[PDB]
C-alpha cells in the first residue's frame, strides 16, 4: 500500500527559529536513495530540530487492501494532498492544502506516481 | 581548525555587537570572545545578516561548534549557525606562548670574523608575534608615539641561532635571525558594531625606514633579547633551518656606522680619502650587498691598505673568486693573503658590453655587478664610458614587482575618494630626482625603453667632465616638439634596442613619396602606417656585414628617429627612400642599423587562438587528436633517431646548423652518447613543462612572418599572396591541392589563410583571406613576406586589433579543415584623445608618469580574467562581457602610448582559476572546456690538454655557482629547473636572465675556440689533438678526484 518509504535526515531550516509563529520549511536529504526534500511543517505542534531522523511514507489510501478515498496508529503526522506538477532527476510538487512539498530524487525511484491524484503523507520521528 | 574565527550564519537585524557579546559570554566562558565584527552595507546604520566572531582559545571554538551542532544556541528566537571563516579579524596567534611582550629588539650584522656582534640601534618594549599559519613574524615597535610593524617571513630568514646576553653559556637569553632579504615596514594611521576588545580601529600602510640613523636598512641580522625560557626552544624550533647549537656573543660599539643619506648600505667615501679605483670599490660594494661579507668586515684599514696597491687583473680575479665562495666569509684578509681595447672589439663583433645592474628596494639597494649583456645603440658612440651606464630596477624586498597597494593607497576623504601617496612614492621620486651616488660618481636619469617601462627599469648615466647626461639627451634629438608626456618618453626611449652597426648615409638622398589615405563611414583608415621602400643595392650592402646569404624581401629597420619595415622593389630609383608618416622626432644622426631581417619559424597555437576559434564550429576531436599525435611523436623521439631530426627541423629553426642537429641525422644508438641523450631528455622535459604551463601546438603547415605591401594595386579587398620556404615535411610530399611548387625552396599557397597576432580578445579578428597566384606578383620576387593590397575599405592591420606595419609578426597557416563560414566584424581601433601640455617638459612630469605606471597597471590580469570567463560561461566571445574585456585590454595596451588608465572594475575579477594554472594558493575549479580536456589528456600521458680542461671546468663551475646552477644541463641549456620567489611569477625577467646566461656561455665558447685555434695552428695536428682530447675525456680512468666535465671536447 506504501509507494515510497525511506529514512530522511533534516539538514537546515528556512526560518531557523523556535518561536516565529510561522510555518517552517525544512530541507531533508534521504539516506541511501539520496533524495532532496522540501516540506512545510508547523514546529509549534510538531517540533523538529536539526540532525533529527524521521521516516516518511506515501500511500494512496489509509485503508488496508483497497478502499481508496488503518495506518493512523503507526504514524503521527498524517497529511492529505494532491500532485499537480510532475515535470522536473524527476521531482514532485504536492500541496497539502497550500503546504507545498518538493521531493527531488532519481527518475527510477519515482515512477509509479500519476498526475492529479490524491496521496497521503505518513511521517514519524522514530 | 587552522584559524579561530567563526562566522555566524544568521543573526537578528535589530541587535548590536554588545548584545551578541553578552550572549556569547553568558553561554560560553567569561571574556572568551576576542573580536566581534558585524558587517554593514551602509556606513553605520545597516548591519548585514551575518557576523564573524573571533575566539581566544581553540577549545572555546570547539565548544561553540559543539553547541551549535546541537542547536543549543538560541538568541532572540534565532538559531545561531556556526561556520568556518576565510580570514581572521586580527592577525593574532592563538597560542599565548608565542606572544612576547616587553622585550628588547636590536639590529646589527656579523661585524667581526670571531663570535662578535655589533648593535646599531636598540628598541625596548617591543611586541613579537609568531604566525605559523601565515609563515611570518610580526614585530611591533613604538617610536615617537606612532607604532611601526616589521614583517619577516620564513623565507626571509636562512638560519636560526640562539645566544645569551647575561654571559652564561647554559642559559639562553638571545636569538639570532639571519636575514637574506629586507623586512617589510608598516605604519599605523588614524565602532558601534566593532568591539575588538582593544584599540584596533586603524589600518597599516607600507612605509620606508622610520629610524633616524636608518639602522634597519643597513642591518642584515636581527637579535631578540628575551628572558630565559625552559620551553622557548620548542617555540623557536618551528623556524626553518634551526641549528641546535649554543653560541655566545659580545656587544661591539658600532654606533659610528650611521648614514643619514637615502642610500644607506653604501660605504663612506670620506673614510678612504685616496685615489682608490672606482671598479674595485664597486666590486667591494657588490660583495657587501651580497650575503658574503658584512659592512665592518670590509671597512677596516688593513683590507683597503692591502687592496690599494696591487695588480688590477689579479685583484679582479681574487674579488670574483671571493664572490664565488659558497658560504659566508668571515675573515677576508686571511682569504686574500692565502689566495696569493677589447671592449671596442667585442662591441664591433657581437655587441658585448659589461653593464652594471642595480636593484632598488624600499629598505636597501642591491648591486648585482658587471653582468654581460647585449649592447644597444647609445653605447656605440659612447663606448669610453662603459662603466657610467647602470641599469636601475625598482623591485620589492623579494626582488618582485611592487604591489599596487604599496603605492598610492586609496582613501575616502570628503565627498569623493582621493588616493594618498605613500612614503615609498616619495622615496622613488627622490631617488629619480637626486640620483644614486656610488663612489666618486653620481648617476643621472637618461631615459627608459618601452620594455623597461613594463618592467620598472630605467637607464642611468654618471655625469662626467667630458659628456654629461644632458649632452647625450640633446645628442639623441630634440624632444621639445612633443607636447605629450607619454609620447615624449616613448620617443626618447625607443632608440635603445639591440642592433647591428652598418654604413653611414648622409641626408642628401631621401625621398618624400606621398602616402594613401581612405576615409569611409566617417573613420580615418590609413594603409601606410610604417611601410617603406628599399632597393636591391641597399639590401646587398646591408646584408654584407650581417653574414646573410639570401636577400629577404622585407626587414625591419630604424634610423634617425624613423621606424618601420621596408619592402624590396624592381623599379627603384636610388638606394634609399622614405615616406611621410614615419618621422617621430628630429635627430642629429642618421646611423643605419637592422634588428631583424627574416625568421621563417614554424607557427604555434597559443591559448587565445584556441579560445577564439572554439566558437566558429571547430570541434574538440580535432584538437584532441592533434595533441595525441603531438605527444605520440614526442615520446617516440627518444628511442628513434629519425624523429629527432624531423622534430629539430620543424620545431625551432627551419634551417639551423648545430652540433646536435648534425648528429641527429647520423649518430649512434640513443643509449650511447650520454652528452646527447641527456640533452634530448632535458629538452623533452622542458617541452612538457612548457605544454603544462601554456598551450603551444606545433603545426607544420603554418609559419610566422611579417607583412608588407607592393606598389601594384592589383589585389582587391580579400585577396593576398602567401609564400614561405619548404620544410622537411613539405619537401617529402610537395603534392597538395593548396600547395603550389613554384620553386624548389619556395612553395606558394592557394588555401584559406587567416591572420592572427599574440594578443587577441575579439571574435572579429578572424578574417579569412583567399590566397591567389599571379605571374606579375612572382616577377617582383617576394619572399618571407605576405602581400597586402593597397586599396580596400579598411587595411588588414586595422582589422588585426588595430595594428600597424611596424615589422610586427603575423601568424599564417594554409590549413583546410578550419571553418570560414562564420565572419564577424572587427572592433573599433580608435584610441583615446591625446593629452597635450601647455609647457615644455621640466623632467618632473616624466618622472611622475614613470612612477604612476606601476599604479593601476592591470595589463596582466585582463587576459587571465577573459580566459576564466570564456572557460566558465558557454558561448564565449559573444557576450558583452568579452567585448568589455577586449576594450579594456586594448586601452591597457594603449596606456604605454597615451596616458589612459585601464580602470579595471572590481566586479570583473574572476576569483577562481582552472587546473592548468600555477596559482596553487588560489582556489582551483575543474574545467570542462577544451583546455580542460587537453590538460587532462596531457596529465594522463605523463602518468697541455689537462691545463686547458681544468681551466674550462673551473670557469664553467664558477659561472654555475655565480648563477646558482648546480648541474651542467641547466647552465648549458639556459633553463633552470629551480626557481626563486620572483623568477616564477613573471617570464620577462627569466627570459632576460636566460639570454644573459646564453650570451655568457657563447662568450666562453668563443674564448675556447680562440684558445684551440692558438694552441695548435696546424690542420692535421689540430685534428690529432682533438682526437686525443676526445680519447682522454672518454676514458673513465683519466678523471681526477674533482668533477670531470665532458662538455669540453664537444665544440662542433
mmCIF file with all atom_site columns, N, CA and C in Angstrom, chain A residues 12-20 49-51, chain B residues 10 68-71 74 76-81:
data_model
loop_
_atom_site.group_PDB
_atom_site.id
_atom_site.type_symbol
_atom_site.label_atom_id
_atom_site.label_alt_id
_atom_site.label_comp_id
_atom_site.label_asym_id
_atom_site.label_entity_id
_atom_site.label_seq_id
_atom_site.pdbx_PDB_ins_code
_atom_site.Cartn_x
_atom_site.Cartn_y
_atom_site.Cartn_z
_atom_site.occupancy
_atom_site.B_iso_or_equiv
_atom_site.pdbx_formal_charge
_atom_site.auth_seq_id
_atom_site.auth_comp_id
_atom_site.auth_asym_id
_atom_site.auth_atom_id
_atom_site.pdbx_PDB_model_num
ATOM 1  N N  . UNK A 1 12 ? 18.734 21.653 7.160  1.00 0.00 ? 12 UNK A N  1
ATOM 2  C CA . UNK A 1 12 ? 18.626 23.038 7.593  1.00 0.00 ? 12 UNK A CA 1
ATOM 3  C C  . UNK A 1 12 ? 17.162 23.454 7.580  1.00 0.00 ? 12 UNK A C  1
ATOM 4  N N  . UNK A 1 13 ? 16.875 24.546 8.282  1.00 0.00 ? 13 UNK A N  1
ATOM 5  C CA . UNK A 1 13 ? 15.536 25.108 8.365  1.00 0.00 ? 13 UNK A CA 1
ATOM 6  C C  . UNK A 1 13 ? 15.526 26.482 7.712  1.00 0.00 ? 13 UNK A C  1
ATOM 7  N N  . UNK A 1 14 ? 14.473 26.761 6.945  1.00 0.00 ? 14 UNK A N  1
ATOM 8  C CA . UNK A 1 14 ? 14.368 28.061 6.287  1.00 0.00 ? 14 UNK A CA 1
ATOM 9  C C  . UNK A 1 14 ? 14.273 29.219 7.275  1.00 0.00 ? 14 UNK A C  1
ATOM 10 N N  . UNK A 1 15 ? 13.405 29.191 8.308  1.00 0.00 ? 15 UNK A N  1
ATOM 11 C CA . UNK A 1 15 ? 13.369 30.322 9.247  1.00 0.00 ? 15 UNK A CA 1
ATOM 12 C C  . UNK A 1 15 ? 14.473 30.258 10.290 1.00 0.00 ? 15 UNK A C  1
ATOM 13 N N  . UNK A 1 16 ? 14.888 29.041 10.652 1.00 0.00 ? 16 UNK A N  1
ATOM 14 C CA . UNK A 1 16 ? 15.872 28.820 11.714 1.00 0.00 ? 16 UNK A CA 1
ATOM 15 C C  . UNK A 1 16 ? 15.440 29.490 13.016 1.00 0.00 ? 16 UNK A C  1
ATOM 16 N N  . UNK A 1 17 ? 14.151 29.369 13.335 1.00 0.00 ? 17 UNK A N  1
ATOM 17 C CA . UNK A 1 17 ? 13.610 29.962 14.535 1.00 0.00 ? 17 UNK A CA 1
ATOM 18 C C  . UNK A 1 17 ? 12.833 28.943 15.346 1.00 0.00 ? 17 UNK A C  1
ATOM 19 N N  . UNK A 1 18 ? 12.670 29.257 16.630 1.00 0.00 ? 18 UNK A N  1
ATOM 20 C CA . UNK A 1 18 ? 11.969 28.384 17.563 1.00 0.00 ? 18 UNK A CA 1
ATOM 21 C C  . UNK A 1 18 ? 10.544 28.836 17.848 1.00 0.00 ? 18 UNK A C  1
ATOM 22 N N  . UNK A 1 19 ? 10.315 30.140 17.978 1.00 0.00 ? 19 UNK A N  1
ATOM 23 C CA . UNK A 1 19 ? 9.000  30.689 18.299 1.00 0.00 ? 19 UNK A CA 1
ATOM 24 C C  . UNK A 1 19 ? 8.636  31.799 17.319 1.00 0.00 ? 19 UNK A C  1
ATOM 25 N N  . UNK A 1 20 ? 8.827  31.532 16.026 1.00 0.00 ? 20 UNK A N  1
ATOM 26 C CA . UNK A 1 20 ? 8.499  32.504 14.992 1.00 0.00 ? 20 UNK A CA 1
ATOM 27 C C  . UNK A 1 20 ? 7.007  32.590 14.701 1.00 0.00 ? 20 UNK A C  1
ATOM 28 N N  . UNK A 1 49 ? 14.010 19.396 15.181 1.00 0.00 ? 49 UNK A N  1
ATOM 29 C CA . UNK A 1 49 ? 15.309 20.037 15.314 1.00 0.00 ? 49 UNK A CA 1
ATOM 30 C C  . UNK A 1 49 ? 16.273 19.515 14.255 1.00 0.00 ? 49 UNK A C  1
ATOM 31 N N  . UNK A 1 50 ? 17.351 20.272 14.045 1.00 0.00 ? 50 UNK A N  1
ATOM 32 C CA . UNK A 1 50 ? 18.352 19.896 13.056 1.00 0.00 ? 50 UNK A CA 1
ATOM 33 C C  . UNK A 1 50 ? 19.097 18.652 13.527 1.00 0.00 ? 50 UNK A C  1
ATOM 34 N N  . UNK A 1 51 ? 19.343 17.729 12.597 1.00 0.00 ? 51 UNK A N  1
ATOM 35 C CA . UNK A 1 51 ? 20.014 16.487 12.903 1.00 0.00 ? 51 UNK A CA 1
ATOM 36 C C  . UNK A 1 51 ? 19.103 15.342 13.291 1.00 0.00 ? 51 UNK A C  1
ATOM 37 N N  . UNK B 2 10 ? 23.160 33.381 10.660 1.00 0.00 ? 10 UNK B N  1
ATOM 38 C CA . UNK B 2 10 ? 22.043 34.313 10.737 1.00 0.00 ? 10 UNK B CA 1
ATOM 39 C C  . UNK B 2 10 ? 21.975 34.928 12.126 1.00 0.00 ? 10 UNK B C  1
ATOM 40 N N  . UNK B 2 68 ? 26.559 24.639 18.709 1.00 0.00 ? 68 UNK B N  1
ATOM 41 C CA . UNK B 2 68 ? 25.812 24.988 17.506 1.00 0.00 ? 68 UNK B CA 1
ATOM 42 C C  . UNK B 2 68 ? 25.293 23.745 16.794 1.00 0.00 ? 68 UNK B C  1
ATOM 43 N N  . UNK B 2 69 ? 26.093 22.675 16.763 1.00 0.00 ? 69 UNK B N  1
ATOM 44 C CA . UNK B 2 69 ? 25.658 21.445 16.109 1.00 0.00 ? 69 UNK B CA 1
ATOM 45 C C  . UNK B 2 69 ? 24.453 20.832 16.809 1.00 0.00 ? 69 UNK B C  1
ATOM 46 N N  . UNK B 2 70 ? 24.323 21.048 18.115 1.00 0.00 ? 70 UNK B N  1
ATOM 47 C CA . UNK B 2 70 ? 23.190 20.548 18.881 1.00 0.00 ? 70 UNK B CA 1
ATOM 48 C C  . UNK B 2 70 ? 22.043 21.547 18.960 1.00 0.00 ? 70 UNK B C  1
ATOM 49 N N  . UNK B 2 71 ? 22.157 22.690 18.276 1.00 0.00 ? 71 UNK B N  1
ATOM 50 C CA . UNK B 2 71 ? 21.120 23.724 18.260 1.00 0.00 ? 71 UNK B CA 1
ATOM 51 C C  . UNK B 2 71 ? 20.775 24.193 19.672 1.00 0.00 ? 71 UNK B C  1
ATOM 52 N N  . UNK B 2 74 ? 20.294 29.789 21.248 1.00 0.00 ? 74 UNK B N  1
ATOM 53 C CA . UNK B 2 74 ? 19.060 30.477 20.879 1.00 0.00 ? 74 UNK B CA 1
ATOM 54 C C  . UNK B 2 74 ? 19.125 31.896 21.424 1.00 0.00 ? 74 UNK B C  1
ATOM 55 N N  . UNK B 2 76 ? 17.306 35.481 20.916 1.00 0.00 ? 76 UNK B N  1
ATOM 56 C CA . UNK B 2 76 ? 16.152 36.194 20.367 1.00 0.00 ? 76 UNK B CA 1
ATOM 57 C C  . UNK B 2 76 ? 15.475 35.371 19.268 1.00 0.00 ? 76 UNK B C  1
ATOM 58 N N  . UNK B 2 77 ? 14.929 34.223 19.685 1.00 0.00 ? 77 UNK B N  1
ATOM 59 C CA . UNK B 2 77 ? 14.240 33.238 18.846 1.00 0.00 ? 77 UNK B CA 1
ATOM 60 C C  . UNK B 2 77 ? 14.924 33.019 17.497 1.00 0.00 ? 77 UNK B C  1
ATOM 61 N N  . UNK B 2 78 ? 16.255 33.053 17.488 1.00 0.00 ? 78 UNK B N  1
ATOM 62 C CA . UNK B 2 78 ? 17.046 32.762 16.300 1.00 0.00 ? 78 UNK B CA 1
ATOM 63 C C  . UNK B 2 78 ? 18.075 31.695 16.641 1.00 0.00 ? 78 UNK B C  1
ATOM 64 N N  . UNK B 2 79 ? 18.154 30.662 15.807 1.00 0.00 ? 79 UNK B N  1
ATOM 65 C CA . UNK B 2 79 ? 19.119 29.584 15.993 1.00 0.00 ? 79 UNK B CA 1
ATOM 66 C C  . UNK B 2 79 ? 20.418 29.971 15.295 1.00 0.00 ? 79 UNK B C  1
ATOM 67 N N  . UNK B 2 80 ? 21.461 30.220 16.082 1.00 0.00 ? 80 UNK B N  1
ATOM 68 C CA . UNK B 2 80 ? 22.744 30.632 15.532 1.00 0.00 ? 80 UNK B CA 1
ATOM 69 C C  . UNK B 2 80 ? 23.471 29.431 14.941 1.00 0.00 ? 80 UNK B C  1
ATOM 70 N N  . UNK B 2 81 ? 23.854 29.542 13.672 1.00 0.00 ? 81 UNK B N  1
ATOM 71 C CA . UNK B 2 81 ? 24.606 28.506 12.979 1.00 0.00 ? 81 UNK B CA 1
ATOM 72 C C  . UNK B 2 81 ? 26.041 28.978 12.795 1.00 0.00 ? 81 UNK B C  1
#
